[PDB]
Amino acid sequence: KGEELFTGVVPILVELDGDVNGHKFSVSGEGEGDATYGKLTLKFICTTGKLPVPWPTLVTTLVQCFSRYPDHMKQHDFFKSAMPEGYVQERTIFFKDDGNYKTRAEVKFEGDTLVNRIELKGIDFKEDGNILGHKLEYNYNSHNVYIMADKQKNGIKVNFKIRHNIEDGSVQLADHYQQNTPIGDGPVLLPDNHYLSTQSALSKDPNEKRDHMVLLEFVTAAGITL
Ligand SMILES: [Ca+2]
Ligand SMILES: [Ca+2]
């Protein structure tokens, strides 16, 4: 059963290849997750030089199996139920009055390590918009991630609105639409409607000269009562 894989601290690896308006880049991340506490700690490095988009815009793309599901909601945890074989996670992310990301990721175990491998494609960005113009603050807001079953794909459909602070005090909306499908043919938990409540803190390693992001995140499932 997939839930038993997450009772302790699990090492995480993230690998992303991206192309945003023809700017090609790669990101590698390492850290660990402790789903008992809904906790993630990770450090990401841009391995190709300078990241051509703001780090915050990649947070959602860069492992919802580490969410804390309350005991009374554990029959609604799709993400862990798909493990260890994993799931495909696909998104379209529409940046208001700007371009979009489309992403396809596979999240699964490689031995004891939870791996997220992603291909990201961004098109229609404005050269001097908030994304390619690097006008977004280095911080991150707290969100609600809404989950429902998608029975005909044997998976889930997920929607939410990310709010990225702009350096002028305004907000850059990033509308997220997501689909997750299991990779194995084994049974998964197709959940009742509920949501995940997220919080993330971004920081820098004062000794790191590469372009990077340190992330501490807590996520708790909610919306189904005792
Ligand atoms: Ca700036
Ligand atoms: Ca039900």
Residue numbers in the entry: 3 to 64, 68 to 231
Paper excerpt:
Since it's discovery and subsequent use as a genetic protein tag, Green Fluorescent Protein (GFP) from Aequorea victoria has become one of the most important and powerful tools in cell biology. In the case of wt GFP Ser65, Tyr66 and Gly67 main-chain atoms cyclise after the protein folds to form, in the presence of O2, the highly conjugated planar p-hydroxybenzylideneimidazolinone chromophore. The crystal structure of wild-type GFP (wt GFP) revealed that the chromophore is packed within the core of the GFP β-barrel structure protecting it from quenching through water dipoles, paramagnetic oxygen or cis-trans isomerisation. EGFP has greater folding efficiency (increased fluorescence due to a higher proportion of correctly folded protein) at 37°C, has a single excitation peak at ∼490 nm and has been codon optimized for expression in mammalian hosts.
Here we report the crystal structure of the native EGFP without any purification tags present to 1.35 Å resolution. Crystals grew in the space group P212121 and contained a single molecule in the asymmetric unit. The crystal structure of EGFP displays the traditional β-barrel structure with the chromophore located in the core of the protein. The most obvious effect of the F64L mutation comprises the exchange of the bulky and buried phenylalanine side chain for a smaller leucine side chain in the central chromophore containing helical structure. The substitution causes β-strand 2 to pack tighter with the core. Val29 shifts closer to the chromophore upon the additional space being made available by loss of the aromatic Phe64 side chain. Replacement of Ser65 with Thr results in the hydroxyl group of Thr65 in EGFP occupying a different position from the corresponding hydroxyl group of Ser65 in wt GFP, probably as a result of steric effects due to the additional methyl group of Thr65. The hydroxyl group of Thr65 now donates a hydrogen bond to the backbone carbonyl of V61 instead of Glu222. In contrast to other S65T-GFP structures the electron density of the Glu222 carboxylate side chain in EGFP suggests that it occupies two distinct conformations. The occupancy of conformers A and B were set to 70% and 30%, respectively, in order to satisfy the electron density for this residue.
